[PDB]
Design a protein around this ligand. Sequence first.
Ligand code: 9OD
Ligand code: 9OD
Ligand code: 9OD
Ligand code: CL
Ligand code: CL
Ligand code: CL
Ligand code: CL
Ligand code: MG
Lengths: 116, 115
Amino acid sequence: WVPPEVFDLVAEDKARCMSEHGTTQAQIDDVDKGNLVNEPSITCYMYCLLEAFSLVDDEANVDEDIMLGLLPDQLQERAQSVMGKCLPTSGSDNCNKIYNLAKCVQESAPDVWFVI
Amino acid sequence: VPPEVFDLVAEDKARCMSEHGTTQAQIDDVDKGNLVNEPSITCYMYCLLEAFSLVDDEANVDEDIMLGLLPDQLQERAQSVMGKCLPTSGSDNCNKIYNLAKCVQESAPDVWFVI
Ligand SMILES: CC(=O)CCCCC/C=C/C(=O)O
Ligand SMILES: CC(=O)CCCCC/C=C/C(=O)O
Ligand SMILES: CC(=O)CCCCC/C=C/C(=O)O
Ligand SMILES: [Cl-]
Ligand SMILES: [Cl-]
Ligand SMILES: [Cl-]
Ligand SMILES: [Cl-]
Ligand SMILES: [Mg+2]
């Protein structure tokens, strides 16, 4: 046995997603605080992070069951009502659909946000 | 009032470790690629994969979800590893995941991916 090089999937996904969508760290910091803008460098970044855990496919379809598994116990009941209101996604393109979803979630549950 | 921000991965690990009596030291060892066939840690590993929909209630791997964790450039290597290591086998869910982790480690020994 030789020590392997270890890769944190979350870290590697954020590095890749930020590079593939031209996202700045300031932008990521804003997103991590729940502050969003309808600009692809933000919204396609969010999309990219969701897709890397199979929370969305490549056609903006969100997998509710995968999402529920990730959420903590204390948010399960609320999450079911919020996703019932906010899914299926709708918008102008893949990334705007994810924008609209995020905004729908914030409207329904203004005290809840997450970072992957 | 700013929203409370939940760290999903941190929550999932916290929940699994509390369910299985798993210590941070155990999780840190696995994160370094050190594996042992001990339920307190192997059941944690199963729990975490299950939370991510990577495995079902019998520790069967969902191949599309597992491959979906990885970037495009790693799909071929990942598929090769899955050819060697799936389907899972073992005496219970925790042992199935232990055998899977060990297979994955042996099959791609230069690298170790962790949620
Ligand atoms: C429907 C639901 O509960 C959560 C989906 C909201 C989108 C959140 C995106 C988060 C991120 O990209 O960090
Ligand atoms: C259970 C788990 O953490 C999944 C690890 C990610 C997929 C396995 C990687 C294969 C490869 O990249 O060598
Ligand atoms: C069997 C396999 O492919 C991966 C084993 C589980 C690794 C999951 C990492 C968990 C953590 O980092 O806490
Ligand atoms: Cl983009
Ligand atoms: Cl959807
Ligand atoms: Cl479209
Ligand atoms: Cl399997
Ligand atoms: Mg994919």
